[PDB]
Amino acid sequence: LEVRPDKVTILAQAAERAEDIDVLRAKAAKERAERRLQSQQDDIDFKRAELALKRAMNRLSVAEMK
Amino acid sequence: LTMAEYFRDEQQDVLLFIDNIFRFTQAGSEVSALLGRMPSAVGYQPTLATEMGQLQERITSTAKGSITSIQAIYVPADDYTDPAPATTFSHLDATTNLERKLAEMGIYPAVDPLASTSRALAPEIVGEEHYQVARKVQQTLQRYKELQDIIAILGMDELSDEDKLVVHRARRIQFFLSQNFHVAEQFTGQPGSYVPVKETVRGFKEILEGKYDHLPEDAFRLVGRIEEVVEKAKAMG
Description:
The structure is cut from a larger assembly and holds chains A and B.
Chain A: E1 2-4, E2 7-9, H1 25-31, H2 34-37, H3 40-55
Antiparallel strand pairs in A: 1-2
Chain B: H1 2-9, E1 14-18, H2 22-34, H3 48-53, E2 67-71, H4 83-88, E3 94-95, H5 100-105, E4 117-118, H6 128-154, H7 161-176, H8 185-188, H9 197-209, H10 226-234
Parallel strand pairs in B: 1-2
Antiparallel strand pairs in B: 3-4
Helix pairs in contact in B: 6-7, 6-9
């Protein structure tokens, strides 16, 4: 808590305008958790990309040069 | 040829040094036109093949005398598909195919390590030890060859810690394949070397076996026996 005569700063690792209950910020710490793991797409595009990059290189884009 | 044929069939072994057997076939096409012949592929004489058949087998060793011949074969426009040298291939027990690329690399003699061949490469001829190294070198030289498009596009950054090693060895092996030819010196100024077969076989072993994976490439460039590389190595710093 930064208490200044003219201002109050609340540092929070995690803060969500939430109800009386706390066992919500956990709820938000929940519905956000795996819904951040679900971000395999991040990984999987790059796969498909590292894929294409090694399929245009498959034809050995140079056969003994030429 | 008739000269060497003398000492072979009239008396001993003979070394027939024919410089550019190409000029024979070449001059051939020069006349083939005027003979009133139907031009063949590329405009070469329709007899190119046979004309060379009747002058090759003659250069051979018999039960009477032996003929070890080494012929220079020019490659027109660097095209190994050209009827002249192409057709020539099926005439040799051993070949040494020279590449312009390797030449500009500074690799001399610029000899294709994956093209040059010999009927000798057999375990039933050169021994196992010499054989396996032989292919081992070629293997890792090829594996480097394939990698080249990636290197040329993505650099070495995305190569495995295993393929990289193969890039180092390969290079240093492709460099150690360079040699000091006594008939050089007057230009470059380096003296020269004849590397014994046992010492070549061994030298590459260690390199494939990784005793040298520390020494920089340039150390292995233009040398003799593998010991020299270590010498020229320290000289580097």
